[PDB]
Amino acid sequence: VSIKKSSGLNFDNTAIAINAGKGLEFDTNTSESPDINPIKTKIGSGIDYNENGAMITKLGAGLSFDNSGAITIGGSGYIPEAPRDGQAYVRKDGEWVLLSTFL
Amino acid sequence: VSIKKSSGLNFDNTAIAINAGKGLEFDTNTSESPDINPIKTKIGSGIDYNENGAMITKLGAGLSFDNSGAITIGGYIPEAPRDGQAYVRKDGEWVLLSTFL
Amino acid sequence: VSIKKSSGLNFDNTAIAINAGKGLEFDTNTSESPDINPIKTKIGSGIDYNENGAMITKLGAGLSFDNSGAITIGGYIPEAPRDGQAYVRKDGEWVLLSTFL
């Protein structure tokens, strides 16, 4: 049987196998293992699978996802830079308000 | 044909198929689908593909890549000096309240 | 040979090949390449391999993994109280503007 070994297949003894490299492995923890093992990705710190088997970033304290599914520091109480106009600012009701309005 | 089923292949009514598990799927949205579907990764929040089809982390406010492509936090505000005096924020720096009183 | 082309295999010059899509590529940088190229994931910025060949998020300054493998922030100032009053920063704490007016 003709296989293309430059395209990820090889012979394991007499038999065609996937030749899995970095980031991939065979799932030996299914119902049908070890006889039948699907190929799956191989993931470590920072990455998880969701309920549908998609890879997502695994976020802990201080990180969240925005509206676009992008990772953001949020989200956290951390305070963004005040406007760079030439005037002094103070913090009022979660916003930057000029010092003038109180002088 | 003999196949190694313990290595990610299986038979689907006589035909050799990839047996795709977690993190992987067939792309049924290509020009040649559904009769010919390549295998691709399966990705969700926090991950995207770039122009070359490589997986990257999808970054939003406050995060960016450094020169080595690591995710970094480095424009949120550092602590003001701890000298005994009140400070306000002027031109991206901490300036004493005195200079305006 | 019968192959299921809707499941990630296709013919290339009558040989069976994996039809690799987004997030996958063949590794042409092995000791047996390009005669033999394993299939691997295709990764870019924000992702790396560890020594076990698992994909990890590539973390730079200000970010670390917690003990459950999640990305977390490792020196920014917290939000001031939301009571209706203006605040200034004094001695590593939020102090009302009133006390200085």
Coordinates of C-alpha atoms in Angstrom, one line a residue:
Chain A
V1 CA 0.0 0.0 0.0
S2 CA 1.4 3.4 -1.0
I3 CA 1.6 6.0 1.8
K4 CA 3.2 9.4 1.8
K5 CA 5.6 9.5 4.7
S6 CA 6.4 13.2 4.2
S7 CA 2.7 13.8 5.1
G8 CA 2.5 12.4 8.6
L9 CA 1.9 8.6 8.0
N10 CA 4.4 5.8 8.6
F11 CA 4.5 2.0 8.9
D12 CA 4.4 0.5 12.4
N13 CA 5.5 -3.0 11.6
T14 CA 3.3 -3.8 8.6
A15 CA 0.6 -1.4 9.5
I16 CA -0.2 2.3 8.5
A17 CA -0.1 4.6 11.5
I18 CA -0.2 8.3 12.1
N19 CA 3.3 9.5 13.0
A20 CA 2.3 12.1 15.7
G21 CA 4.8 14.8 16.5
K22 CA 5.0 17.9 18.7
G23 CA 1.6 19.0 20.1
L24 CA -0.1 15.7 19.3
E25 CA -0.6 12.3 21.0
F26 CA -2.9 9.3 21.0
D27 CA -5.7 9.3 23.6
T28 CA -5.2 6.2 25.7
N29 CA -8.0 7.0 28.1
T30 CA -11.1 6.4 26.0
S31 CA -13.8 3.6 26.2
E32 CA -12.1 1.8 23.3
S33 CA -8.4 2.1 24.4
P34 CA -5.9 0.7 24.2
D35 CA -7.1 -1.1 21.0
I36 CA -8.5 2.0 19.4
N37 CA -6.9 5.4 20.3
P38 CA -8.0 8.6 18.6
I39 CA -5.4 11.2 17.8
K40 CA -5.7 14.4 20.0
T41 CA -3.7 17.4 20.8
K42 CA -1.2 17.4 23.6
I43 CA -1.6 20.3 25.9
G44 CA 0.1 21.7 29.0
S45 CA 0.0 24.7 31.2
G46 CA -2.2 27.6 30.1
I47 CA -4.4 25.5 27.8
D48 CA -7.6 23.4 28.5
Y49 CA -10.3 21.7 26.6
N50 CA -13.9 23.0 26.7
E51 CA -17.0 20.7 26.9
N52 CA -17.0 20.3 23.1
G53 CA -13.3 19.4 22.9
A54 CA -12.0 22.8 21.7
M55 CA -8.7 24.2 23.1
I56 CA -9.1 27.4 25.0
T57 CA -6.7 29.4 27.2
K58 CA -7.0 28.5 30.9
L59 CA -7.4 31.8 32.8
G60 CA -6.8 32.3 36.5
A61 CA -6.8 35.3 38.8
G62 CA -6.8 38.7 37.1
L63 CA -7.5 37.4 33.5
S64 CA -10.8 37.2 31.7
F65 CA -12.2 37.0 28.1
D66 CA -13.5 40.1 26.4
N67 CA -16.5 40.3 24.0
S68 CA -14.3 38.9 21.2
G69 CA -13.0 35.9 23.1
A70 CA -9.7 37.7 23.5
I71 CA -7.7 37.5 26.8
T72 CA -7.7 40.7 28.9
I73 CA -6.5 42.0 32.3
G74 CA -9.8 43.3 32.4
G75 CA -11.7 43.0 34.3
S76 CA -9.4 43.5 37.2
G77 CA -9.8 46.6 39.4
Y78 CA -6.5 47.8 38.0
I79 CA -6.5 51.4 36.9
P80 CA -5.8 52.7 33.3
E81 CA -3.6 55.7 32.5
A82 CA -5.2 59.2 32.9
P83 CA -5.3 61.5 29.8
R84 CA -2.0 63.1 28.8
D85 CA -3.2 66.6 28.1
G86 CA -1.1 68.7 30.5
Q87 CA -3.6 68.8 33.4
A88 CA -3.7 67.1 36.9
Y89 CA -6.3 64.4 37.5
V90 CA -8.0 62.7 40.5
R91 CA -10.1 59.6 40.7
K92 CA -13.9 60.0 41.1
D93 CA -16.6 57.3 40.7
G94 CA -14.3 54.9 38.7
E95 CA -13.2 57.7 36.2
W96 CA -10.6 60.4 35.7
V97 CA -11.8 63.8 36.7
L98 CA -9.8 67.1 36.5
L99 CA -8.4 68.5 39.8
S100 CA -9.7 72.0 38.6
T101 CA -13.4 71.1 39.3
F102 CA -12.6 70.9 43.1
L103 CA -10.2 73.8 43.5
Chain B
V1 CA -4.9 -2.9 4.3
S2 CA -3.6 -3.2 7.9
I3 CA -3.9 -0.1 10.0
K4 CA -2.7 0.6 13.6
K5 CA -6.0 1.6 15.4
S6 CA -4.1 2.4 18.5
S7 CA -2.4 5.2 16.5
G8 CA -5.3 7.4 15.5
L9 CA -6.7 5.5 12.5
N10 CA -10.0 3.5 12.2
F11 CA -12.2 2.0 9.6
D12 CA -15.5 3.7 8.6
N13 CA -17.4 1.0 6.7
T14 CA -14.3 -0.4 5.0
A15 CA -12.5 3.0 4.3
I16 CA -9.5 4.2 6.3
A17 CA -10.4 7.3 8.3
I18 CA -8.6 9.5 10.9
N19 CA -10.1 9.0 14.3
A20 CA -9.9 12.6 15.6
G21 CA -10.2 13.2 19.3
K22 CA -9.9 16.2 21.7
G23 CA -8.5 19.4 20.1
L24 CA -9.1 18.3 16.6
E25 CA -11.9 18.2 14.0
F26 CA -12.5 18.0 10.2
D27 CA -12.9 21.3 8.4
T28 CA -16.3 21.1 6.7
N29 CA -16.2 24.7 5.5
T30 CA -13.6 24.4 2.8
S31 CA -14.0 24.7 -1.0
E32 CA -13.9 20.9 -1.4
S33 CA -16.1 20.1 1.7
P34 CA -18.0 18.1 2.5
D35 CA -16.6 15.4 0.2
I36 CA -13.0 16.2 1.1
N37 CA -12.4 17.7 4.6
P38 CA -8.8 18.3 5.9
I39 CA -8.2 17.7 9.6
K40 CA -7.5 20.9 11.7
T41 CA -7.3 21.9 15.3
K42 CA -10.5 22.8 17.2
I43 CA -10.1 26.1 19.0
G44 CA -12.2 28.4 21.2
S45 CA -11.8 31.4 23.4
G46 CA -8.3 32.8 23.9
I47 CA -6.9 31.2 20.7
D48 CA -7.0 32.2 17.0
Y49 CA -5.4 31.4 13.7
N50 CA -3.0 33.8 12.1
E51 CA -2.6 34.4 8.3
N52 CA -0.5 31.2 7.9
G53 CA -3.0 29.0 9.8
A54 CA -0.9 28.8 12.9
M55 CA -2.5 29.0 16.4
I56 CA -1.8 32.1 18.4
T57 CA -3.2 33.5 21.7
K58 CA -5.9 36.1 21.0
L59 CA -4.9 39.2 23.2
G60 CA -7.2 42.1 24.2
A61 CA -6.8 45.1 26.5
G62 CA -3.6 45.3 28.7
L63 CA -1.8 42.3 27.1
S64 CA 0.7 42.2 24.2
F65 CA 3.5 40.1 22.9
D66 CA 7.2 40.8 23.7
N67 CA 10.0 40.4 21.1
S68 CA 10.1 36.6 21.8
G69 CA 6.3 36.2 21.3
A70 CA 5.6 35.7 25.1
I71 CA 2.4 37.2 26.5
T72 CA 3.2 40.2 28.7
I73 CA 1.5 42.8 30.8
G74 CA 4.0 45.6 30.0
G75 CA -0.4 50.9 30.5
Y76 CA -1.8 50.5 34.0
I77 CA -0.7 52.6 37.0
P78 CA 2.2 52.0 39.4
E79 CA 2.1 53.0 43.1
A80 CA 2.8 56.7 44.0
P81 CA 5.7 57.5 46.4
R82 CA 5.3 56.6 50.1
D83 CA 6.7 59.8 51.6
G84 CA 3.7 61.3 53.6
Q85 CA 2.3 63.5 50.9
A86 CA -0.8 63.5 48.7
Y87 CA -0.4 62.9 44.9
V88 CA -2.4 63.5 41.7
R89 CA -1.8 62.2 38.2
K90 CA -0.4 64.6 35.7
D91 CA 1.0 63.7 32.2
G92 CA 1.6 60.0 33.0
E93 CA 3.4 60.8 36.2
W94 CA 2.8 61.3 40.0
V95 CA 2.9 65.0 40.9
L96 CA 2.3 66.5 44.4
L97 CA -1.1 68.0 45.3
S98 CA 0.8 71.0 46.8
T99 CA 1.8 72.5 43.4
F100 CA -1.9 73.2 42.6
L101 CA -3.2 74.3 46.1
Chain C
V1 CA -7.3 1.2 -0.9
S2 CA -10.5 2.8 0.2
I3 CA -10.1 6.1 2.3
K4 CA -12.7 8.4 3.8
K5 CA -11.7 11.8 2.4
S6 CA -14.3 13.6 4.5
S7 CA -12.1 12.4 7.5
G8 CA -8.7 14.0 6.8
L9 CA -7.1 11.6 4.3
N10 CA -6.6 12.2 0.6
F11 CA -4.5 10.7 -2.2
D12 CA -1.3 12.4 -3.3
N13 CA 0.1 10.8 -6.5
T14 CA -1.9 7.6 -5.6
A15 CA -0.3 7.5 -2.1
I16 CA -2.4 8.0 1.1
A17 CA -1.6 11.3 2.8
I18 CA -2.9 13.2 5.8
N19 CA -4.8 16.3 4.4
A20 CA -3.7 18.8 7.1
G21 CA -5.6 22.1 7.6
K22 CA -5.5 25.0 10.0
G23 CA -3.3 24.6 13.1
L24 CA -1.5 21.5 11.8
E25 CA 1.6 21.1 9.6
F26 CA 4.2 18.4 8.9
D27 CA 7.5 18.8 10.7
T28 CA 10.2 19.1 8.0
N29 CA 12.9 19.7 10.6
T30 CA 13.4 16.2 11.9
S31 CA 16.5 14.0 11.4
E32 CA 14.5 12.0 8.8
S33 CA 12.9 14.9 6.9
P34 CA 11.8 15.3 4.4
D35 CA 11.7 11.6 3.6
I36 CA 9.6 11.2 6.9
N37 CA 7.8 14.2 8.4
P38 CA 5.5 13.6 11.5
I39 CA 2.3 15.6 11.7
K40 CA 2.5 18.3 14.4
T41 CA 0.5 21.4 15.5
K42 CA 1.2 24.8 13.9
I43 CA 1.8 27.4 16.5
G44 CA 2.8 31.1 16.6
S45 CA 2.9 33.9 19.0
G46 CA 1.8 33.2 22.6
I47 CA 2.2 29.4 22.3
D48 CA 5.2 27.2 22.8
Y49 CA 6.1 23.5 23.4
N50 CA 7.4 22.2 26.6
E51 CA 10.0 19.5 27.0
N52 CA 7.3 16.8 26.8
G53 CA 6.1 18.2 23.4
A54 CA 2.8 19.7 24.9
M55 CA 1.5 23.0 23.9
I56 CA 1.7 25.7 26.6
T57 CA 1.0 29.4 26.7
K58 CA 4.3 31.3 26.5
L59 CA 4.3 33.7 29.4
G60 CA 6.4 36.9 29.7
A61 CA 6.7 39.7 32.2
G62 CA 3.9 40.1 34.7
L63 CA 2.2 36.7 34.0
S64 CA 2.6 33.3 35.7
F65 CA 0.9 29.9 36.0
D66 CA -1.0 29.3 39.2
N67 CA -1.0 25.8 40.8
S68 CA -3.8 24.7 38.6
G69 CA -2.1 25.5 35.3
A70 CA -4.1 28.7 34.7
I71 CA -2.7 32.0 33.6
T72 CA -2.6 34.6 36.4
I73 CA -1.2 38.1 37.0
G74 CA 2.0 38.4 39.1
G75 CA 2.6 46.2 40.6
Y76 CA -0.6 48.2 39.8
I77 CA -2.9 50.2 41.9
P78 CA -6.5 49.0 42.9
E79 CA -9.7 51.0 42.2
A80 CA -10.6 53.8 44.6
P81 CA -13.9 53.7 46.5
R82 CA -17.1 54.4 44.4
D83 CA -19.0 56.6 46.9
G84 CA -19.3 59.9 44.9
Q85 CA -16.2 61.6 46.2
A86 CA -12.8 62.5 44.6
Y87 CA -9.7 60.7 45.8
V88 CA -5.9 61.3 45.7
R89 CA -3.1 58.8 46.5
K90 CA -1.3 59.2 49.9
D91 CA 1.1 56.7 51.5
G92 CA 0.0 53.7 49.4
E93 CA -3.7 54.4 50.1
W94 CA -6.8 56.3 48.8
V95 CA -7.4 59.5 50.8
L96 CA -10.2 62.0 50.1
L97 CA -9.4 65.2 48.3
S98 CA -11.5 67.1 50.9
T99 CA -8.8 66.7 53.7
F100 CA -6.4 69.0 51.7
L101 CA -8.8 71.6 50.3

